[PDB]
Structure 1
């Protein structure tokens, strides 16, 4: 079911594709980033073609689209990480079991930012030994969300008398969301990897 604009991988299951400045695909990501990170410079933007992560993600998206009916369940968000984590995320995606405690914790899960400026902090996109910083542009199934709490290992129930019917994700603030936390595998597809510098 792979997207028809992907490069042919020749029966291979994984590839990183370097994008060209001046293509709409590169420029939309550069514009989304520079909206809040004008003081940084992009080295390169790579499209992540991961057949297995895409398949599992698209199954979860179809399930949430059925369960929620006519919600926009998917947001495009940012995730800063260290160079050591890039090979794992490219191949296997975002694993809550490896996530650090956030400085403002809304639950024990993987964090995604609305603004590139948040993810660009050195605490998330740690500069490597050559001064390169790494940030993913991620399709995230935020679905129906509520304000999180530090104790959570899953999203909370919608209704306390029905403990297994859950919100899809949590946020810092439902009125003005700046971060989302997800608690399940294959709820986030790493779509682009931005390499950038001071």
Structure 2
């Protein structure tokens, strides 16, 4: 079941679809971005239609919904990256083995921001040769989360006496989360690519 609102991809498995401003789908992403990035301007927003990534992500979403007690397991988050990474993320998603060490490390995993502003820093969304910055808008299975720790390679157990019964993700602060870290493949779907400039 690929979402019915996607463009027909004609038996092909990947497509980047450029959105039209004035449509709700474009305007809602612009507003979530501009709420903390008013100093920047969007060149374009592309919807990522990746059938394999969607299938694997929605399988993990279904399992986390079954495992957790009627939780909102999914957040819409931002990820700034450099241009060299964009073809790889587009095709293969977020690979923790490729992840930057974050300035404040709450674990060795893939980082995702509540605020576009955080992802808009040049450290993440490194401007390319043409001054273009790249930011993903990402469905993330944050699930049940705890404050992380720089040493984590997996999320911590909820209970030290049950080592395999893990939290889903970790955050910088559980009362005001600004960051989430995930430690497993297909726990994040890159849904949109915002291309933007100063």
TM-score by length of 2: 1.00
Measured against aligned partners, the alpha-carbon deviations of 1:110-150 in whole angstroms (never above 9, x if no partner) come to 00000000000000000000000000000000000000000
SS of residue paired to 1:55:
helix
Structure 1: distance between partners of 2:172 and 2:69: 24
SS of residue paired to 2:91:
helix
Residue 140 (structure 2) aligns with = 140
C-alpha RMSD of matched pairs (Å)? 0.3
Question: Cα offset for 1:161?
Answer: 0.3
Question: Cα offset for 1:69?
Answer: 2.2
Question: Cα offset for 1:155?
Answer: 0.1
Correspondences of 1:167-186 after superposition (within 5 Å): 167-186=167-186
Structure 1: distance between partners of 2:69 and 2:28: 28
SS of residue paired to 2:154:
coil
Structure 2: distance between partners of 1:91 and 1:98: 14
SS of residue paired to 2:79:
strand
Q: Where in structure 2 are there 5+ consecutive unaligned residues?
A: none
Structure 2: distance between partners of 1:69 and 1:2: 26
Measured against aligned partners, the alpha-carbon deviations of 1:136-184 in whole angstroms (never above 9, x if no partner) come to 0000000000000000000000000000000000000000000000000
Structure 2: distance between partners of 1:18 and 1:185: 26
Residue 152 (structure 2) aligns with = 152
Structure 2: distance between partners of 1:19 and 1:99: 28
TM-score by length of 1: 1.00
Structure 1: distance between partners of 2:189 and 2:156: 23
Structure 1 residue ranges (4+ consecutive) displaced by more than 6 angstroms after TM superposition: none
Structure 1: distance between partners of 2:101 and 2:70: 34
SS of residue paired to 1:31:
helix
Question: Cα offset for 1:100?
Answer: 1.1
Structure 1: distance between partners of 2:102 and 2:176: 19
Question: Cα offset for 1:41?
Answer: 0.3
SS of residue paired to 1:117:
helix
State the aligned residue count.
Answer: 198
